[PDB]
A paper describes a structure:
We were able to determine the crystal structure of the BsSufS dimer to 1.7 Å resolution, revealing high structural homology to its E. coli counterpart. One molecule of SufS was found within the asymmetric unit (AU) and could be built to completeness. The BsSufS monomer forms a tightly intertwined homodimer with another monomer across the crystallographic symmetry axis. The interface and architecture of the BsSufS homodimer closely resemble those of E. coli SufS. The enzyme consists of two domains: A large, N-terminal domain (residues 1–294) and a smaller, C-terminal domain (residues 295–406). In the N-terminal domain, a 7-stranded, parallel β-sheet is sandwiched between several α-helices to form a tightly packed core. This domain harbors the active site pocket, where the cofactor PLP is bound to Lys224 as an aldimine. Furthermore, residues 253–265 (herein referred to as the ‘β-hook’) form a hairpin-like structure that latches on to the other monomer. The small, C-terminal domain consists of a 4-stranded, parallel β-sheet and four α-helices containing the flexible ‘Cys361-loop’ with the nucleophile Cys361. We found BsSufS in the product-bound state, with alanine bound near Cys361-persulfide, suggesting that one reaction cycle had occurred.
In all of these systems, the Fe-S cluster is formed on a scaffold protein before it is transferred to a target apoprotein. A cysteine desulfurase acquires sulfur from cysteine in a pyrodoxal-5ʹ-phosphate (PLP)-dependent reaction and then transfers it as persulfide to the scaffold protein. However, only the product of the sufS gene is involved in biosynthesis of Fe-S clusters. BsSufS assumes a type I fold of the aminotransferase class V family, consisting of an overall α/β fold that is highly similar to that of E. coli SufS, IscS, NifS, and CsdA.
Residue numbers in the entry:
A (entry chain A), B (entry chain A): 1 to 413
Write the structure that this text describes.
Amino acid sequence: MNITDIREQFPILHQQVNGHDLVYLDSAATSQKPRAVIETLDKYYNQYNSNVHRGVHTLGTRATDGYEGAREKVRKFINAKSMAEIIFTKGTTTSLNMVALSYARANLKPGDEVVITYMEHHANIIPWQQAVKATGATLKYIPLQEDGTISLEDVRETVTSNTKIVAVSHVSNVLGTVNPIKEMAKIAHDNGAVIVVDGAQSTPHMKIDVQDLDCDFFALSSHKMCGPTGVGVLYGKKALLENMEPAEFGGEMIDFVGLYESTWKELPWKFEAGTPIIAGAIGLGAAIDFLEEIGLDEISRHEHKLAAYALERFRQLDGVTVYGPEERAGLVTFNLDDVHPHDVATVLDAEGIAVRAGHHCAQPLMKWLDVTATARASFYLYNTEEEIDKLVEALQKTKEYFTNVFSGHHHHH
Amino acid sequence: MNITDIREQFPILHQQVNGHDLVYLDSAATSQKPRAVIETLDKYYNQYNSNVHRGVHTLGTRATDGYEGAREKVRKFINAKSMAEIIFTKGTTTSLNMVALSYARANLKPGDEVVITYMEHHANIIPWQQAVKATGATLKYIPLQEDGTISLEDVRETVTSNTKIVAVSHVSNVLGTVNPIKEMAKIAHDNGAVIVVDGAQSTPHMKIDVQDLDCDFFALSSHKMCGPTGVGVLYGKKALLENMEPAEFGGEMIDFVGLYESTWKELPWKFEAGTPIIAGAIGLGAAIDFLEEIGLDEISRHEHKLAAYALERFRQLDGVTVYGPEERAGLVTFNLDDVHPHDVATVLDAEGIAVRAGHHCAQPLMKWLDVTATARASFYLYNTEEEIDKLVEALQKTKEYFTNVFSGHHHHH
Ligand SMILES: *Cc1c(COP(=O)(O)O)cnc(C)c1O
Ligand SMILES: *Cc1c(COP(=O)(O)O)cnc(C)c1O
């Protein structure tokens, strides 16, 4: 856990922006990669790239063993029962779409309900909007408490015997809320519904055990957990996946192809059409190895300390609003009084500090918060308390700068 | 074009398999990558990885400029009119599925026809099987001539005023046939149909000009053209894409998101849901730069010479059947009399030689050929006449080996 030694493994952190040391606080948008991951990609392309299938030629066997070896690493990492339940996809968004297309569009009829929350990312809203439209079903929202948490009483109220799907984020990328997924799964199941978990913001930062959560589906993205871009995972309980039709069709996912009719491969390959994301999946396996070596519990404890420190330091600033609860993941979404968050991000980037401004792909949540946009600083395993000091110092300077501009302007005119 | 200097750029070629120099003749399954591409990925992750959108922070702007810069490289490379017509996808298979989902399922009714050919890869068969099933339309096949080419008279016969979609490979990955796509497009259009071109095997090997072809849709894969795995392109004429609904939904592809209804971004981003395939797309741009520097006409001429040499040398072998026409792309699919092609591939890999055996994702074509499987050697810009000499020498040895085993066995028993 020596943080200097961790940071030494991430080449991208060692540079300057606008003549200042880079302070990267946008890991919730995408994470940075250690040498172990980057070198895994290089070794792949330098030494054993080939299309998959064993029993053909040597490099082909190496590539296949790498690819399927990564599938097993994923299985172990989330504690799934079987590799049949681990599907490689392009990312969380594609994973959630696959569930909406192959499960929801097949199992919803008029009168059935899909239940989501106001804090969902767009990836876990729009596929369900489309699925309910296609089927004549109903979309419903679980309300939030005043601090941006979900009460289990509101879940019990909203979920009914007509509910077929409950879809929810494990962790919000805006509020930092950790939702009570295990308890929500029980409520879903008691009502005859499945639960679909958007795990994009939880997987990088805390241990996932899908057997303990009892989630029916779980989606994650490589690029948020030190892995390559363009790859993700869909986990689904084997019994559900066995009864779902493929979302995409082509080579690799078939068994027999006739002129008019075809039959599908067994799981997981039923859901993997075309040449797979070979290098990316292998690289994601390397990210998992890297994270496990540090320890996800160790990473969670570091983030708990960074979050506590940030919240305290933000409370030292006058004229700053922080959104969400005290108990949270490693991020802070905020606004400065009388400064647009896009201007905050601009001024901070001039100091080397990378944060994000906008709606963070959660427009319904922005409306619930009664704002159009916010600024967000997000932390990961390579971030330090010194970086949070720099952030809060820069925010104080930003307030002073805009105050002076306002007074200069009012005096003129 | 010095071939030694070209080969020097591909680190993977400089190794031994089973104590023999590697002879990689499976580029039709996947291509190998030059240092220029591999180093592009490394630079990305080492220096400017961030999620996309300009106007936020410095690395974010660099990443976005890289990503959108690659889109323009693609546009130029295939001579599309606009970047609005260039969509990044996971690969050819996903591209073809997107057309089947968003165009075919929206424009087909009972009585309408989708017309394909017996030589199509599964990626360009199964999505249409599913689309016709979903809509009550009819799937029809254009017959092949005796040498595995398509006659334009058969296309005129098969395509009718009820035909809405003609889908065809530019180049067959089994026969090596180059199909007359420009003339087929005219026949499609005259009948009121669109044409969908599977360009996975043409793009790596010959110049593509979509304005000259007049194709409505064109799909390609990065991994076959010296680029990263997990990325491809869908080209579509802007007027068609404007009227098609998205195939996947989420962040990045929206403009406004309400509780129940959402509106979409303009092209091309309408069709790119979620965090994009950032590194892969940038790497594909580097592959395009690399190929353009060598020259695609130069690559086509090299492959024409390799194909001519291979066909001549195969005709020197007794007891070998080659499938397809004399005028062809850079590949040879074949069978040895009385030797299963899987055994051919196994014996060749013991000599360092990588070829592929099976159905090559073209089961209907195997049936048309009256075989269950075949062996395939395929060539690209880093392959030489010496490698073809090694292949034919190994095939002669294979025939002699199996003949001796057969005689040994018959004498015993
Ligand atoms: C490889 C290939 C495909 C499939 O492409 P993927 O990259 O596997 O999606 C489709 N058509 C042809 C002609 C090919 O050679
Ligand atoms: C980033 C994120 C997503 C979207 O994931 P992509 O990798 O962009 O597909 C979904 N949900 C949450 C909670 C996220 O943080």
